[PDB]
Amino acid sequence: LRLPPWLKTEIPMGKNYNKLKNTLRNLNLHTVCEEARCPNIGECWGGGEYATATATIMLMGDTCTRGCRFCSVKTARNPPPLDASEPYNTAKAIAEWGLDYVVLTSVDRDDMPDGGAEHIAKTVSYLKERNPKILVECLTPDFRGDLKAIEKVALSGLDVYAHNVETVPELQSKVRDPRANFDQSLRVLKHAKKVQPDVISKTSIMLGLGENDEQVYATMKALREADVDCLTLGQYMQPTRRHLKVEEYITPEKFKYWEKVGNELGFHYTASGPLVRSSYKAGEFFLKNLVA
Ligand SMILES: C[S@@+](CC[C@H](N)C(=O)[O-])C[C@H]1O[C@@H](n2cnc3c(N)ncnc32)[C@H](O)[C@@H]1O
Numbered sequence: 386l387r388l389p390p391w392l393k394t395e396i397p398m399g400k401n402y403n404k405l406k407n408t409l410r411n412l413n414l415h416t417v418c419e420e421a422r423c424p425n426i427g428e429c430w431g432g433g434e435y436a437t438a439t440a441t442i443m444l445m446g447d448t449c450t451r452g453c454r455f456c457s458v459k460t461a462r463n464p465p466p467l468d469a470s471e472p473y474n475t476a477k478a479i480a481e482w483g484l485d486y487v488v489l490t491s492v493d494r495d496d497m498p499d500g501g502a503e504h505i506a507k508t509v510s511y512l513k514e515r516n517p518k519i520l521v522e523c524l525t526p527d528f529r530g531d532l533k534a535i536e537k538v539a540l541s542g543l544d545v546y547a548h549n550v551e552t553v554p555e556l557q558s559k560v561r562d563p564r565a566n567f568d569q570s571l572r573v574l575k576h577a578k579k580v581q582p583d584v585i586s587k588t589s590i591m592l593g594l595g596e597n598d599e600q601v602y603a604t605m606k607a608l609r610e611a612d613v614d615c616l617t618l619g620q621y622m623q624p625t626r627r628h629l630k631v632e633e634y635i636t637p638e639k640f641k642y643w644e645k646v647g648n649e650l651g652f653h654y655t656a657s658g659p660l661v662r663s664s665y666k667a668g669e670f671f672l673k674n675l676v677a
């Protein structure tokens with residue numbers, strides 16, 4: 386039981402924030418920020434000085450078919466069916482908020498035959514046909530290794546394909562649902578490079594789940610062997626008392642250390658920090674390292 390000082394946040398202020406909160410409920414859309422109970426809700430939904438207010442619309446309802454021990458998203462054996470109007474409503478809300486870069490994610494839908502690859506592809510297609518110059522990033526589930534489902538999402542005009550390994554291979558069984566493993570997540574990023582050679586790969590790992598420095602170095606080196614372009618490192622924070630406890634709060638100095646090691650291995654940009662999540666300032670990192 387430890388409580389750190391550098392992981393403290395603020396109660397969400399509602400200057401430019403209720404516009405996003407009321408838009409998500411007008412279209413009956415969900416977001417991973419509210420379900421996962423992220424502390425960076427105020428920073429991402431409301432730019433302090435000059436930060437475009439962005440969000441992470443979570444598709445296919447607020448209930449996941451999997452039960453990951455680090456995630457607080459609701460889990461049910463059979464979630465409600467797909468909403469056909471979700472891909473169309475998402476494209477309207479994103480263009481309404483004036484975003485030049487958007488990130489989209491969804492819960493795992495193991496009950497769907499394609500796992501929702503067609504539903505995600507229609508959300509990106511409706512969003513790119515409406516605004517061709519907008520940048521889209523998809524935080525895609527593993528689809529249980531369905532190479533056809535991964536191909537359908539990667540060929541939807543996607544700019545950055547994102548799928549997280551979450552933690553080191555030695556902690557896949559304790560942290561993630563058994564339907565997801567380390568080698569499976571790498572085959573999601575590898576196949577996205579084969580089907581779409583000009584795509585940008587991106588993944589996110591979490592620290593504080595019992596991993597050591599030796600295990601983290603081998604994971605990043607294996608990701609570079611998978612030709613993964615981008616990497617994200619962040620401190621795992623306990624969502625609820627029912628979930629996993631934090632094992633070790635990584636110091637901000639060591640968080641900066643892995644940023645240099647990522648630059649050594651050749652990662653196009655390594656975003657590391659205690660509060661750094663997968664989509665945390667993802668558009669700001671795109672403008673600083675992925676142009677030229
Ligand atoms: C809910 S997942 C959605 C992607 C997809 N459903 C999957 O997991 O394969 C979105 C992100 O939230 C993050 N997340 C959930 N709970 C977290 C926590 N307690 N601390 C840090 N990150 C968390 C995970 O890292 C994950 O990458």
Ligand SMILES: *C(=O)CCCC[C@@H](S)CC
Pocket residue numbers: 417418421422423424441621622624662663664665
């Ligand atoms: C608490 O740590 C949950 C963090 C959720 C991060 C979402 S908003 C983006 C990956």
Ligand code: SF4
Pocket residue numbers: 449450451452453456457458491492493562
């Ligand atoms: S797959 Fe795991 S991390 Fe993703 S929404 Fe479901 S329980 Fe949460």
